[PDB]
Copies of this chain bind each other. A is one copy, B any other.
Amino acid sequence: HVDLTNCDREPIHIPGYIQPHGCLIACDNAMRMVLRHSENCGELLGLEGDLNGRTAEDVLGKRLVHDLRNALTTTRPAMLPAMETSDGRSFDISLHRYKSTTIIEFEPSDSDTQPLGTARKMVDRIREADSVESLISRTTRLVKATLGYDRVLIYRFEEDGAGKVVSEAKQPELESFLGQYFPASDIPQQARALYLKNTLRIISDASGTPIPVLPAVDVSGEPLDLSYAHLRNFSPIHCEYLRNMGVAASMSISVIVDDALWGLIVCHHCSPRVLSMPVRIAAAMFGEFFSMFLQVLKQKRRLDTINHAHAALDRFLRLAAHRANLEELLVDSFQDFARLIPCDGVGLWVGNNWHGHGATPPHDAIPRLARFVASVSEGRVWATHALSQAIPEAEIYADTAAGMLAIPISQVKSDYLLFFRKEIVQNLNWAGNPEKSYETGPMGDRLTPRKSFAIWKESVRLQAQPWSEADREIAETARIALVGVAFHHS
């Protein structure tokens, strides 16, 4: 039994079932004997009786078996389109070997389309993108038009594992999820693990009847690990979620950046849909190039941000050389430092005097805040996205300032440049429908986009957008510049 209490630990890699759009045969490490097979092997390949025990040549024919062994020459599955059985029937075959077990997957051959041709057209239309924003926006549009799914989304994973919908292409009649968040729990760790192993993940029919693998567990008491099997059946928890949304089919493409799971490209269809192997090969290659291009664009953006910060700090260091009183320059200029680090407000605490710009804590709250900073800082940059966790009093003004980054501007006195961010929920740009409801099944209304978003919103109460690595290494460069010039002026 699987329910909302144990589904964070569900063994989704050994479900003992496949999807009905193909059939599976498991063989020994060297592909001599047939250890396991799907119930629909007979119906689809045209074979009578149990196949477990019969030799590889006996079931498939000596002609085909020879070609499969040659291909095994790595857990990366081999794609063999338009192969032919002894019977004469045509099949697209996925072949892989994992935990010294050979798995063979059969699809009815729909191979009348060149895979490289499609992928090259697609990759050409994204290669010339000059920003992350331009790549993500055009990609959902492009995939929707090329693969013809009713909805295409891109999810980006936040630091805390939560997903954000950063791009959407949909049918006009469907509701928008653009700018909406889902919590980390909506995609368990074992699911993220498999998304990192498999580029592509297909669900042909959410309402389809799953086909069992025989035997479900062997003599040794070992289940069949379908980690790299494209026919692997899906969790009944996720199944119920898609049916509640009106989604019959899906296909997700894994976005790998610096060897980490950055996010997913996810295609939803309102009717059943399986893509042929040749189209899945093209989509996978598109996924690889999209991933590589986003990686370079992220690097280029990081670089530009740090360059801009250096130039800004140079401009300031030149002004500081021509002005006698440094304290007066800081009081006139401090708001300009808001251009270095994305913030909703910035403040200057110098000689027990406060000066604020934008969304900052109230005037009366600053001395307590400044004392706290002076105690924990230890003359280094200090940052939190959850200010109320450190100062319970700070809860009262979280709507204005939930996050703080503090920069020491003096080696000697306790003077600081303070950067502030409003709580995440204030900065929301949701494009969905508030009076949009969802049908539910046995498990409850937990498995609806409406409730997912509500759970996320509670998880990030009194918290701001976390300070990135780029934000912290700019803050550190600013600390050295300001401490440096403050020393010269004494």
Contact B127 A292 (CB under 8 A): no
With both chains docked as a complex, state the minimum distance between the C-beta of A92 and any C-beta of chain B, in angstroms: 20
Contact A303 B295 (CB under 8 A): no
Instruction: Tell me, yes or no, whether A430 is within 8 Å of chain B by CB.
Output: no
Binds B, one of A188-196, A272-280, A482-490: A482-490
Contact B306 A480 (CB under 8 A): no
Per the bound structure, the CA–CA distance linking A300 and B116 in Å amounts to 42
Contact B120 A483 (CB under 8 A): no
Contact A123 B299 (CB under 8 A): no
Residues A307-338 near B (CB distance < 8 A): 307, 310
- Residues from chain B with Cβ under 8 Å of A484 in the complex: 123, 127, 289, 292-293
Instruction: Tell me, yes or no, whether A473 is within 8 Å of chain B by CB.
Output: yes
Per the bound structure, the CA–CA distance linking A303 and B299 in Å amounts to 11
- Residue in contact with A487 in the complex, picked from B120, B473, B490, CB distance below 8 Å: B120
Instruction: Tell me, yes or no, whether A173 is within 8 Å of chain B by CB.
Output: no
Instruction: Tell me, yes or no, whether A72 is within 8 Å of chain B by CB.
Output: no
Q: Mark A465-478, 1 if CB is under 8 A from B, else 0.
A: 00000000100110
Q: Mark A108-140, 1 if CB is under 8 A from B, else 0.
A: 000000001000100110010000000000000
With both chains docked as a complex, state the minimum distance between the C-beta of A115 and any C-beta of chain B, in angstroms: 12
- Residue in contact with A480 in the complex, picked from B293, B411, B477, CB distance below 8 Å: B293
Q: Number of residues in A with C-beta < 8 Å to the partner? A: 31
- Residues from chain B with Cβ under 8 Å of A480 in the complex: 292-293, 295-296
- Residues from chain B with Cβ under 8 Å of A303 in the complex: 303, 306-307, 310
- Residues from chain B with Cβ under 8 Å of A127 in the complex: 484, 488
Q: Mark A427-457, 1 if CB is under 8 A from B, else 0.
A: 0000000000000000000000000000000
Check A306/B299 contact, CB under 8 A, given A127-B488, A292-B484, A293-B484: yes
Closest to A117 in B: B490
Closest to A487 in B: B123
Contact B299 A483 (CB under 8 A): no
With both chains docked as a complex, state the minimum distance between the C-beta of A319 and any C-beta of chain B, in angstroms: 16
Closest to A473 in B: B299
Per the bound structure, the CA–CA distance linking A483 and B307 in Å amounts to 28
A-B contact pairs, 12 of them (CB 8 A): A74-B378, A123-B488, A127-B484, A288-B411, A289-B484, A292-B483, A293-B480, A293-B484, A296-B480, A299-B477, A303-B303, A303-B310
